[PDB]
Amino acid sequence: ELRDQQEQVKEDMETKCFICGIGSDYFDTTPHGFETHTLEEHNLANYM
Amino acid sequence: AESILEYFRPYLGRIEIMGASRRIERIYFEISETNRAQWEMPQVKESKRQFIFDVVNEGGEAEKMELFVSFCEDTIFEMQIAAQISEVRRLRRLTAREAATALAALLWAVVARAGAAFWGELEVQRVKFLNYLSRNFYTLRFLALFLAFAINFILLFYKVSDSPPNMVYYFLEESTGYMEPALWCLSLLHTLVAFLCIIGYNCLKVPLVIFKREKELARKLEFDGLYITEQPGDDDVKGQWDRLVLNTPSFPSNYWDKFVKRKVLDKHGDIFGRERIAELLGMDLASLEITAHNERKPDPPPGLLTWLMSIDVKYQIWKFGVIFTDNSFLYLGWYMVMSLLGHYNNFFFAAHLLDIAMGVKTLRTILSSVTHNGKQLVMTVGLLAVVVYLYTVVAFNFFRKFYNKSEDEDEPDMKCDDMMTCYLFHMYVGVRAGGGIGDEIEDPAGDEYELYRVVFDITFFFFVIVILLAIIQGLIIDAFGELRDQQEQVKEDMETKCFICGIGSDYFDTTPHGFETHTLEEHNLANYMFFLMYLINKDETEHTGQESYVWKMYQERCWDFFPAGDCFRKQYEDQLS
Amino acid sequence: MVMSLLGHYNNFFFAAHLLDIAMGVKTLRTILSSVTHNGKQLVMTVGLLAVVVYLYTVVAFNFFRKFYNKSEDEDEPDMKCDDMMTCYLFHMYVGVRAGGGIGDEIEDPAGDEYELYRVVFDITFFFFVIVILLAIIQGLIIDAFG
Amino acid sequence: AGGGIGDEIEDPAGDEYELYRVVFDITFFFFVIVILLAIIQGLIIDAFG
Ligand SMILES: [Ca+2]
Ligand SMILES: [Zn+2]
Ligand SMILES: [Zn+2]
Structure with missing residues (x-):
């Protein structure tokens, strides 16, 4: 249960912007x- | 033209790069026969398959492309090494020896299901000798595992008697009489291959770990100011030890770029002490370095073994420090010394069975799960030597009258009168029980404290027996899930992505x-690995328009010429399908 | 068929035709898949358990010989460590099947100058070849279902 | 038991069949003690998952 949490935290943080909702698929055409x-x-x- | 196109398909390479027009373009070139031959090898393909696994678990930015090219120029050196070495009734009765032989044959068959394998004329033959050892290093290593089981089988017959045939460790074969002389022969033969394993490894592997180490030091001196601009880390040993090699007149020995000294002198030599660069980094007579490429290069006569004293002592000290700190070479050194120490008339040859592990594939895969959580699995044990102690102080001064061993008429052994002999009772005997310390301690009955003991034992059984051993048995179980999930993720991402673009199979399946x-x-x-071998083996005056553009970016270590997001079909989707 | 034919040899051999119970029922054979899914790896652990136990014998054959007795009075014809072959047989047959290791079936180290080389000896044995090398065999099956 | 039927049965020693008993007990401990109780303790663990 705990290890699956950390995997999901790292995965979603890496594949999303956390401020937009846009995934890395759109931000990888360049x-x-x-x-x-x-x-x-x-x-x-910079927001802080 | 079907015949020529069919015949030349294996040699006609093809890559796509982006450059010189901001548009993806394809590149064609000739893949040599030997370069193709040296790539389809069992050794190289496993090395490549290892690299893919590593780069995809620790995966990020163009660092991947930096790793890819760094790997691409490692196998090129590895290829150079590989080129220069090649030239209802009563059943029977079973005695001990018969069952031992049958079971040992079973064990060896299980293991083998791995299937592992004048003063001038000496030089030409010696090079062949060393080239021979390097050529077959795995088969000779596998031979040691043969002799580790053979010696230990013989060792499985000793006996002890106070009267020789101050105890005497005499063998006792079934008079086959053979075993005793065989051990003298097999032990001598074993330590020979153990010695030959080092020489084979030294002439085969470490030229690749010296080249690897000298590679980054030259990269961090030219494209970074490691020792020029900032400093090393002053805490990392590896960044500090190689400070000894800059002064040496033969720093880039194995590595290709032997003019990396002059490169950092032109880059950081202006805004820094141009003389000071020329003393931190060799360059004796920096003026003479200007005039070195003026007249010619006279060739000294070959005086090997006579005035071979002209060796860089400081450099060799550096090289030895790199070798002797290698994890694999140290193990090979440890394997030999025990065999050497095994000729001290002992069993020490029974520690060479552990190679069984650092050898077989599936066997070492299991040891990975144990050692995957080694750091955490120690803490639980450390937590089990705290909890048990925390019970001792509770039982040292409340339940003293119980920890006796029922000696009649006298009790010289109360295992709780002293703290040290109580903590030793709870750790050695308490944990290894199946009931805790309620099984090995008087029965609390009547004693006013018979409810402070029941709460004491069951808490002990609950905490330091069920739970603190379901963690150690639970950390191993989770390790298999962690490792298997890694392999599933490696195969999945490799299959659904291009590894050079980022484009998934959904776009590449419309056709x-x-x-x-x-x-x-x-x-x-x-083909990308085959492209670099093509450029480095082609003089610059013949580089085509596209080839020299890549060769320019490669020497600058800018990897913008990899596609990374667009491949000649997303580019030319509308034009022609 | 042959066992049934051999069962008419006036014997029980007809008690081996019960194993079809497995190669028959669906859910029952599904469970046997988990055991046999990692059969190749699950043998190696056993092979690793017949190495580690042996590696303890050579340590106890020539340091802790005076302990492996069976308390026969006035005579000791059964010292289970005088010979290597009868010591490796003691550590494998009796040592592993215990719940304490070879500290449960061996004299109590007390006083003996080596009573700290035995405590380190037993607990290491219980740690390595009892808890860990049987949490793998019980862990390879659990992962098989997953 | 925790040892199988080698714990509650005379000690095979000398008896011509003392290697047919050792193979008998350890097989019993291996199969119907470790494995056939790591399944019952493994079916419950997988249930939570
Ligand atoms: Ca030209
Ligand atoms: Zn965003
Ligand atoms: Zn692609």
Whole structure:
């Protein structure tokens, strides 16, 4: 039960933006599209 | 033209790259015969299959592409090594020996179901000798496992007698008489292959671990300022030990790029002390380095074994530090010393059976589950040596009158008068019971405290017997689920993705076998390895327009020429289907 | 058929035709699949349990010989560790099937200068070849259902 | 029992059949004690999953 929780936490965090709902499939049509989206663009740390 | 197209299919490579127009383009080239031959090998394919598993459990950004190219240029060196070595009634009666032989044959058959296998004329033959050992290292290693079971079978007949045939450890074969001389022969033969395993490993494997280590140090000096700009970490030993090799005049020995010294001198030599770079990093007579490529390169006469004293002592100290800290080589060193120590007239040859584990595939797979949670599985034991102690202090000064061993007329053994001999009673005897410390302790009856004992025992049985041993038996069970779920995720993601693009099979299935050919005919992470071998073996004056564009980005270590998101069909969907 | 034919040899051999009970019922054979799903791996653990136990014999054959007696008075014709073959047979037949290991069926180490080399000896035996090497055999079957 | 029928039965020693008993007991302990009770304890565990 506990290990499945951690796997689900890491999975959803990795495949979603956590601020939008958009998955990595849309943000991967460009190289590193998702990697920058959660780093350069809105990334829940500039908001603080 | 069907004959030529059919005949040249195995050699006509094909990759897709993106560059020079911001559009995906295909590239064709010639895959050499030997390069194709050295790729279809049992050793290389397993190495590739190992890499795919690793890169997909720890998977991220273009780091994957950096790992892919770093792997791509490892097998190239591995290939170079591989090229230079090749030239209702009464049943019968069963005595001990018969059953032992039958069962040992059963065990060996189960294991083997793995199926593991003048002063100048010496040099040419010695190179063949070392090339011979390196060529067959697994078969010779498997031979040691033969001699580890053979010696231990013979050792399974000793006996002890105070009178020789101060105890005397005499064998006692069924007078077959054979066993005793065989042990002297087999032990001597064993330590020979144990010695030959090191020499075979030294001339076969460690040239690949030196090349690997020198690779990153050169990368972190040119494309990073490891020792120039910032510092090493001052806590990581590996980042600190290799500080000894920069001064050496032969730093990039195994690694290809022997001009990496001059490269960092041109990059970081301006904004830093141009002289100071030339002393941290060798470059004796930095002025003479300018004039080195002026006249010519005279060739010293070959004086091997005579003035071979001219060796970089500092470099060799560095190289030994890398070898002696290797995990695998240390094990091979440990295997040999015990065999050497086994000739001390002892059983020590019974510890070479453990290779049985660090050997068989399925057997080591099981040991992974035990060692997968090794860090956590110790803590439970540490938690079981706390809880048991926490019961001792409760029973040391409330239930002292019980821990006796029923010696009549005198009780010199009360196992709770002292704390140290009470904690030893609860750990050695209390845990290993099946009832706890209620089974090995007087029966609380009448004693005013017979309800403080019942609560005491059942709590002990509940906590430190059922629960604290269902965790140790539960951490192992979960380990199998953790490992099997990994393999399922590796196979699933590999099957439903391209591993070079990100495109799933849903897009590549609108056409019949669309995905099957996409990862076979189009970019398929095997022609890419064949492409680098093509460029490095082709002089720059002949590089075509596309080939030199890639070769330019490769030397800059920018991997933007991999498709990563678009492959020649999403690009040309509307044009022609 | 042959066993039934051999059963007319005036014998019980007709008691082996009960095993069809398995290669017959659906749910019953479904359970046997879990046992035989990891049959290849489940043998290796047993092979690993006949190595570890042996690896304890050589340690107890020449350090703890004075313990493996069966308390025969005035004479000891049965010391189960004087010979290697009769010591490896003691640790496999009796040592494993215990619940305590070989600390339950062996004299009590007390006083003996080696009473801390025995305590480390028994608890290691109970830890390794009793708890762990039987939580694997009981863990390979559990994972089979999953 | 916890040992099978080797715990409650005379000790096979000397008896010409003392290797047909050792194979007899350990097989009994292996099959009808460890395995056929790790299934009953394994069917319940899988039920929660
Ligand atoms: Ca040209
Ligand atoms: Zn977003
Ligand atoms: Zn693709």
